[PDB]
Swiss-Prot record:
Function description: Functions as a GTPase-activating protein for the small GTPases RHOA, RHOB, RHOC and CDC42, terminating their downstream signaling. This induces morphological changes and detachment through cytoskeletal reorganization, playing a critical role in biological processes such as cell migration and proliferation. Also functions in vivo as an activator of the phospholipase PLCD1. Active DLC1 increases cell migration velocity but reduces directionality.
Protein name from the UniProt record: Rho GTPase-activating protein 7
Subcellular location: Cytoplasm; Cell junction, Focal adhesion; Membrane
Site (Arginine finger): R46
Lineage: Eukaryota, Metazoa, Chordata, Craniata, Vertebrata
Tissue specificity: Highest level of expression in the spleen, with rather lower levels in prostate, testis, ovary, small intestine and colon, but none in the thymus.
Included stretch of the parent chain: 1074 to 1279 of 1528
Subunit structure: Interacts with EF1A1, facilitates EF1A1 distribution to the membrane periphery and ruffles upon growth factor stimulation and suppresses cell migration. Interacts with tensin TNS1 (via N-terminus); the interaction is decreased by phosphorylation of TNS1. Interacts with TNS3 and PTEN; in resting cells, interacts with TNS3 (via C2 tensin-type domain) but, following growth factor stimulation, TNS3 and PTEN are phosphorylated which leads to weakened interaction with TNS3 and enhanced interaction with PTEN.
Domain Rho-GAP, first and last residues per copy: 10-192
Comment on protein domains: The SAM domain mediates interaction with EF1A1, and functions as an autoinhibitory regulator of RhoGAP Activity.
């Protein structure tokens, strides 16, 4: 049975109410499919998928049964759908404050302490967000492991994923600075 808006736009806490976990299984299966079968696809997360196929995948995800079979799907549609998932969250995965906190980190904290200040900032995120960010970072880390094939460095992933994870105000210098800080901070994070 089809319930539009049952996944995209739903808060992490409600997902836990419904299924036991902050990400729906249908969403976790998208990551598994990318990780299992799509890591040789050049420019994963960067190259655009096809809107109509991205829309069909959203719709399969918003079926009442929390299970989607992704086989046969282009990696780029799945990757883009994943980005839309985080984009449509009612509050960014990172929360709204962290783009600013990452900026302060790059404004004040010294090179060799930044990772440490980034981990400190992250430990302040809600539980759900912390679980999801952990699962995502290990996933993105696997992607970057296959860099010789897909050409996605921590920096290449970061630049493509920050807006959706942080909800950056994308088309003020401070806003652009937050964008750059969030990207840099995210790249650092993926790199470990």
């Amino acid at each position: 049975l089809y319930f539009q808006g049952s996944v995209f736009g739903v808060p992490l806490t409600v997902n836990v109410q419904r299924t036991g976990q902050p990400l729906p299984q249908s969403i976790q299966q998208a990551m598994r499919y990318l990780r299992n079968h799509c890591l040789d696809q050049v420019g994963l997360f960067r190259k655009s998928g096809v809107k109509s196929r991205i829309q069909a995948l959203r719709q399969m995800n918003e079926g009442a049964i929390d299970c989607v079979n992704y086989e046969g799907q282009s990696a780029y549609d799945v990757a883009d759908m994943l980005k839309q998932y985080f984009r449509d969250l009612p509050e960014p995965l990172m929360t709204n404050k962290l783009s600013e906190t990452f900026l302060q980190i790059y404004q004040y904290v010294p090179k060799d302490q930044r990772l440490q200040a980034i981990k400190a900032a992250i430990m302040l995120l809600p539980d759900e967000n912390r679980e999801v960010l952990q699962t995502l970072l290990y996933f993105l880390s696997d992607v970057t492991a296959a860099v010789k094939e897909n050409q996605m460095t921590p920096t290449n992933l970061a630049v493509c994923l920050a807006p959706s994870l942080f909800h950056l105000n994308t088309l003020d210098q401070k806003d652009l600075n937050e964008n750059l800080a969030a990207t840099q901070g995210l790249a650092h994070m993926i790199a470990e």
